[PDB]
Amino acid sequence: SLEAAQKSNVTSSWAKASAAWGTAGPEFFMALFDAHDDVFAKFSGLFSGAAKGTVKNTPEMAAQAQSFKGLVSNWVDNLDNAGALEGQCKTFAANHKARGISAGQLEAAFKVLSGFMKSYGGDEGAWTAVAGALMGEIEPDM
Numbered sequence: 001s002l003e004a005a006q007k008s009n010v011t012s013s014w015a016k017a018s019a020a021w022g023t024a025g026p027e028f029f030m031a032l033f034d035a036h037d038d039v040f041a042k043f044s045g046l047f048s049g050a051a052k053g054t055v056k057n058t059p060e061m062a063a064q065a066q067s068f069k070g071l072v073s074n075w076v077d078n079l080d081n082a083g084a085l086e087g088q089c090k091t092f093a094a095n096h097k098a099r100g101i102s103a104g105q106l107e108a109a110f111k112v113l114s115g116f117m118k119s120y121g122g123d124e125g126a127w128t129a130v131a132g133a134l135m136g137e138i139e140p141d142m
């Protein structure tokens with residue numbers, strides 16, 4: 001279900017993406033927003049109703065990229081600690097469910113992330129396995 005090699009790949013590839021997140025983070029969000037308009041719709045308050053092709057270089061996007069990195073870094077550092085993973089996922093699920101976000105939408109974010117990580121040496125099958133383990137902890141709380 002989640003092998004030692006899969007965890008090693010996720011950890012090492014995340015460390016490379018993390019080093020470049022200043023530029024990579026906004027590209028990941030744009031990829032997500034172009035593929036799923038229903039996800040971008042949930043960011044209406046943040047972006048003050050602006051069109052999707054204008055948001056990449058705003059301060060708001062830089063802030064969303066920083067929040068995203070901080071949570072994924074916590075998850076990746078605790079891949080052998082289910083108890084810590086569970087706790088972090090419960091908070092995350094509650095906050096997003098409160099905005100009307102669906103489990104399907106979160107899943108879409110993890111599927112875009114898995115392919116986006118190939119650029120940083122990520123094995124997409126490894127990132128899909130880690131997304132599956134985390135969604136099994138998030139989904140029931142949505």
Ligand code: HEM
Pocket residue numbers: 038039040042043045046067068071072092095096099101105106109110
């Ligand atoms: C793996 C997926 C994701 C991660 C790591 C992530 C992480 C976070 C974090 C750490 C925060 C700040 C804490 C909080 O207020 O909840 C945040 C806020 C937010 N996230 Fe997510 N997120 C994910 C997916 C999503 C998806 C798919 C959507 C929309 C459909 C979304 C919409 C939001 C919104 C609207 C906020 C508040 C923005 C603002 O400050 O106004 N996030 N997310």
